[PDB]
A paper describes a structure:
In contrast, design-4 was unfolded but still formed crystals in the presence of sulfate ions. The crystallographic analysis revealed that design-3 and design-4 adopted the homo-dimeric RIFT-fold. Thus, the short In/Del at the 1st loop position is the determinant for the fold transition between DZBB and RIFT. A single deletion in the DZBB sequence converted it into the RIFT fold. Most DNA molecules did not migrate from the well when mixed with the proteins with the stable DZBB fold (design-2, -18, and -19) and RIFT fold (design-3 and -4), indicating that these proteins formed large aggregates with dsDNA.
Here, we study fold transition between distinct β-barrels by protein engineering and structural biology technique. Here, we discover that the previously reconstructed ancient DPBB sequence could also adopt a β-barrel fold named Double-Zeta β-barrel (DZBB), as a metamorphic protein. The DZBB fold is not found in any modern protein, although its structure shares similarities with RIFT and OB. Furthermore, the reconstructed OB fold could also be converted to the four-stranded SH3 fold by a simple circular permutation. Thus, these ancient β-barrel folds (DPBB, RIFT, OB, and SH3) could be readily interconverted by a few feasible mutations through the missing-link fold, DZBB, indicating their significantly close evolutionary relationships.
Numbering used by the authors:
A (entry chain A), B (entry chain A): 5 to 44
Write the structure that this text describes.
Amino acid sequence: GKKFVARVAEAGGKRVVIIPKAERAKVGIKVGDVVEVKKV
Amino acid sequence: GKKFVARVAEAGGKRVVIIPKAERAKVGIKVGDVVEVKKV
């Protein structure tokens, strides 16, 4: 339930939210994890 | 404040949340928009 703020970016012709290593460590996110994305 | 569920994926050597066109339309997200990402 921990969260972080980010910006939608364009990478490889896709709209993505890049998750830096620091943010992964703070929120406890690994590849494959399910997340909730909310527009602010 | 609208939200959608997604999975952290790996693309271009980065950990990202791909946002499909349908999800962008439902949540009202454009590139550059600030979003909140919460681990479920």
